[PDB]
């Protein structure tokens, strides 16, 4: 029960006046850190020509230049309401555009809240399989390209080229789920760092600079579909006003630098002082997100994942909120550093660490 | 294709610099006006505390007990991201409180984006039926208390009552979909002014003043049921600030009277008007909603909303948006007026209407 009273940089402060470094990033969006300064003053500007408009505005196309510009597979783009909406446009246009009906989703992926197939994340095999069987009947793959919803689980070698040379062989498009990994992985998102371009991408989180927002884009011949006649729902202006802004600031030299240097030193303590008493666990880093699980693994799927000591990273958890650290509450939620975030920040964090894991 | 720059009190300035008289109101929310300078200096203030938390904070509160003193069924209420989001969760409620599947829908309403029956709207003894049928499997039955998305749709006397007596008799739940009518059909919503109270509800739109928010309560043992364990989603500071701002402003002496006198006058001139022609039409307003059908009716169910001329409603939104008047695109939708609008502003778009109307 934690209830905040304001943010800002890295920080939180509670209703107690207890202050946080902040590990969490309201899920995502906070890249440049909380409460910018210059994304503020956008705001307070934006804000006087009205909250909401209900139709769209030249911000949308502002922002969606910028997408296209940053984004490889993006050469249209559309916006809609929350990075749900988008998976969700983006499942009914992977049918139509092929029109074929299967989809195809990994257990432990998040998409918000049979024409489903499943398979474990990281499996090339069982996919290659599903197509096998189903050759004329997979609309495409769905996935982030970087798991942050079972615990923070990055691409094994191979995988993404794999899913990209099925989706080819069969017909079918490769989908890439870019809500949390877009513009936090790399300015390009995940799909730009590891050199693999799907036919559609989803986005969100970041690009709203905080305020709720969602996207889809992808090859021109496919977004041509979303037509006039099948298959209010535009952008809101302070959501892209911070977006454009958040953009801006991160493609400013120095910032993917800066988070991959931080997350790697934060990352590789928590390790350290993990195993400094006698812990089993392991982890990593790509960019701002980060994940660590008690157990050993490797973890490259959500079973693994599920091998992770529940009691262990509740205690953690617990000893690290009081040493005025805030990390996600689940085991399965990946961690987000920010450009405010600094190496003093760091090893407090680190510190913390040690403090707490000596104690389990 | 509208592009607008910025909205204020009861009008909209596109990018070709046309200033328009807003009849749609953000599709709800702009209540009290677009950009109310008090809703605006609350957010000002706001935005520099953060953009977004992530998780809960004391506004939720102080909103909280803004709306369990101003809904009568609402005694325990929970906020969510969007009204979509409240009516799912209000959907899982239902099923676990009565440990039943099967919900009663009507044809026509919407609550966003076999288990579900349908009857048409207005429809007391299709509901019957389903009871009849299957006594001992309906969870409950959901509705807009006044239909906003078929056109505008009021219930016919004593189907509200009725719909209660049912629910009762069948030991199943009477839930209100009230994102639309909240606040803007009454301070209390269309249960309150009805004098009809259900066992949930679900709120929305002008609560969030404008940004995007939802929320659902009702009777206490039920919500009790929402606990740790069946069945990061909390509401945006921004949101509520406005939220708490915009009631605030509502509960001030005159409001509703206000919003009841002009759309009275709005309504009727364009019926005098479309009549003055030779066009059949119909329709009513309830406090600030508003419809007029291009047919005569009445319209009492979504059906006979279908007969409307969609030809002519096409020609005279077009025609209409020439007069410097912004109305929903689909007849489909109903009409908004704001606490902005003025007796002068009614005028104007009658004699607007009058102009449109007389060359088709
Ligand atoms: C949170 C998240 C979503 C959901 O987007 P919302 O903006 O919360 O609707 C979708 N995909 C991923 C990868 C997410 O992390
Ligand atoms: C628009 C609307 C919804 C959807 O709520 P969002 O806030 O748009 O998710 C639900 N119910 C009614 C009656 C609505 O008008």
């Known amino acids: 029960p934690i209830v905040f009273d304001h943010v800002k940089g890295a920080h939180i402060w509670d209703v107690d006046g207890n202050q946080y470094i902040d590990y969490v990033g309201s899920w995502g969006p906070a890249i440049v850190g909380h409460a910018h300064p210059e994304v503020i003053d956008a705001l307070h500007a934006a804000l006087e020509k009205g909250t909401s408009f209900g139709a769209p505005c030249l911000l949308e196309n502002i922002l969606a230049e910028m997408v296209i510009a940053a ?82 689980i990055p691409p094994d070698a191979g995988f993404l080229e794999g899913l ?45 600079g905080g305020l709720p927002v969602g996207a889809y884009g992808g090859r021109a011949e496919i977004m041509k579909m979303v037509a006039p006649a099948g298959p209010t729902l535009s952008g809101n202006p302070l959501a892209m006003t911070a977006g454009i802004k958040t953009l801006e600031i991160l493609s400013r030299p120095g910032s993917y630098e800066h988070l991959d240097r931080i997350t790697g030193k934060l990352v590789q303590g928590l390790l350290d002082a993990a195993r400094e008493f006698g812990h089993e666990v392991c982890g990593g880093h790509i960019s701002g997100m980060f994940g660590l699980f008690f157990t050993a693994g490797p973890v490259t799927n959500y079973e693994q994942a599920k091998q992770s000591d529940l009691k262990k990273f509740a205690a953690f958890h617990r000893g690290m909120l009081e040493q005025g650290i805030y990390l996600a509450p689940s085991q399965f939620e990946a961690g987000f550093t920010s450009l405010a975030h600094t190496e003093a920040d760091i090893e407090r964090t680190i510190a913390a660490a040690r403090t707490v894991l000596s104690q389990l």
């Open 164 to 208: 990209r040379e099925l989706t080819k062989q069969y017909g079918a498009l490769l989908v890439f789920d870019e809500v949390m990994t877009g513009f936090r992985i790399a300015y390009g998102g995940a799909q730009e760092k590891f050199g693999v371009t799907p036919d559609l991408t989803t986005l969100g989180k970041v690009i709203g």
């Open 71 to 152: 984004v490889p597979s993006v050469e249209m783009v559309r916006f809609v309401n929350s990075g749900t909406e988008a998976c969700m446009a983006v499942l009914r246009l992977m049918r139509a555009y092929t029109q074929r009906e299967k989809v195809i989703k990994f257990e432990g992926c998040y998409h918000g809240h049979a024409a489903t197939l499943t398979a474990p994340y990281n499996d090339l095999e069982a996919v290659s399989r599903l197509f096998e069987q189903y050759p004329n009947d997979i609309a495409g793959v769905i996935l982030e390209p970087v798991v942050g919803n079972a615990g923070f």
